[PDB]
């Protein structure tokens, strides 16, 4: 179908984070059989292979932003690849990685479909600017490089000179926020970004949360959706092997429901599975659980419904 016509892009990149290890995100997400599982449902999966990220040996912090040139060039490469897989009419399934790659994954996707609406599922806002950041990491600042409303509040970071901010403030919906810094929250409330923090999810139920999300994005006009999932968005009992797990988050069922409701719109046009960190699993079972949850989320984005799926044939024969 026009949906579930996947183009998979590896992104074994971790330099946008503190001392990392998420670069073996694609390796585990694939060795857990993601392509082999996406082919049972009628998906035209094309593996564009793990991106070769050229090395930046001498790459010094900008002011506090750790290793900005590496992240900037990695995201430019990813954006080029994502534009390549979107010109083929596919769904750019960028499985990474860290959100420092979301800058590329959305900037490339917006080169083709300028009017995409982003659904950001993350425990964090990931909206620090290079000025208001505190840890000086770039996994925590991918949205600030994308919002049109933050132009002028984003310094000319080295390596991010190619970034033209693409999404408006009114084209992004946060789901699952439960760990927001004061600067992130000031930016979030000033720009009028629609967000469904954990409190709004508890108040409304995930069903009403997703109904409002889709009526807010796809209400005025049907547009592509770029679900930029982050596995720390789900509760740590389900995804323990992630960078910064925050307790009391979306359950497994709620994550699956988010993805199923996004799929059923049929407008999904890009997906990111970020922050799978198999090095932070206390036990190999924790890594297996995180990877299985990420795989289940990914599959549900592409038609695998919990009620069960059947091919359009007469099974009573």
């Amino acid at each position, epitope marked *: 179908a026009k949906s579930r016509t996947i183009g998979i892009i590896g992104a*074994p990149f*971790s*330099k946008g984070q*503190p*001392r*990392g*290890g998420v*670069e*073996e995100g694609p*390796t585990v997400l694939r060795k857990a059989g993601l392509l082999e599982k996406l082919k049972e449902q009628e998906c035209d999966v094309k593996d564009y292979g793990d991106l*070769p*990220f*050229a*090395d*930046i*040996p*001498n790459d010094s912090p900008f002011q506090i932003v750790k*290793n900005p040139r590496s992240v900037g060039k990695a995201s430019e490469q990813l954006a080029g690849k994502v534009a390549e897989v979107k010109k083929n009419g596919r769904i750019s399934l960028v499985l990474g990685g860290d959100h420092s790659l979301a800058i590329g994954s959305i900037s490339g996707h917006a080169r083709v479909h300028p009017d995409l609406g982003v659904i950001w599922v993350d425990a964090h806002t990931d909206i620090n600017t290079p000025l208001t950041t505190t840890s000086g990491n770039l996994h925590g600042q991918p949205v600030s490089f994308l919002l049109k409303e933050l132009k002028g509040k984003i310094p000319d970071v080295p390596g991010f000179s190619w970034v033209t901010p693409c999404i408006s403030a009114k084209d992004i919906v946060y789901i699952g926020l439960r760990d927001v810094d004061p600067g992130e929250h000031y930016i979030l409330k000033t720009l009028g970004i629609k967000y469904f923090s954990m409190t709004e999810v508890d108040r409304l139920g995930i069903g009403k949360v997703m109904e409002e999300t889709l009526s807010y994005l796809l209400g005025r006009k049907k547009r592509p959706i770029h679900l930029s999932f982050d596995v720390d968005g789900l509760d740590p009992s389900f995804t323990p092997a992630t960078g910064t797990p925050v307790v009391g988050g979306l359950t497994y069922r709620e994550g699956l429901y988010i993805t199923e409701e996004i799929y059923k719109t049929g407008l999904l046009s890009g997906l990111d599975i970020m922050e799978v960190n*198999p*090095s*932070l*699993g206390k036990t190999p079972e924790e890594v297996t659980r995180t990877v299985n949850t990420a795989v289940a989320i990914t599959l549900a984005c592409f038609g695998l419904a919990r009620e069960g799926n059947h091919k359009p044939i007469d099974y009573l024969n």
Partner: antibody
Amino acid sequence: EVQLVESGGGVVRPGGSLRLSCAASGFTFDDYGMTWVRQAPGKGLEWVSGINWNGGSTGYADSVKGRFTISRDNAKNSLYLQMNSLRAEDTALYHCARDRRRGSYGSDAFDIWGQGTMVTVSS
Amino acid sequence: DIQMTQSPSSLSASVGDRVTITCRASQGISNYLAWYQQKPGKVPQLLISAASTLQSGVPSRFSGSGSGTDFTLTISSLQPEDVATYYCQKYNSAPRTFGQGTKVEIKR
């Protein structure tokens, strides 16, 4: 000042076992990604295996895959490497090397090295 | 795996004339190649970080280059205090296998 002092065995005749060590000092240990390389005397080097700032992405060369294991103790600054079922071709001088930069981000070269622990395996 | 092959398994050019070691790899490693120098009886010091990168303190003679599958390491002038064995790291996720080496020497 960035000494990688190596310790451990050096004489095991049978297919026995050893556990080397590399008492690192000078740098923040739980930040860099330490590795182990071997060098048979007068021969080329060979990457034995490597680990993270944490321990958990231990990758091994496809010659010691099922035999060696690296542990690491960030609170105590060591680089234990457990060798098991020595195949007597592992008669090399084993170096511990650092990661050349901060993050243990996977791909990194080897800047600072220890030297020694001449493991011989011998009857 | 990825097999790394130093092209000259040993060479001896001159005090003077340039020297070019090649490290054609097996599958594209794409700018993850470190060139070392051992000076036998000591510890290998690193020379070149990502295929050029001229690590600090290394004399500007070494001008390694290349990307993708095959690379080089062009010593502009040999200057016999550079007589040593040079390696080829291939540092990415974790094959990280070196090369055979390259005995470099002079004549008399």
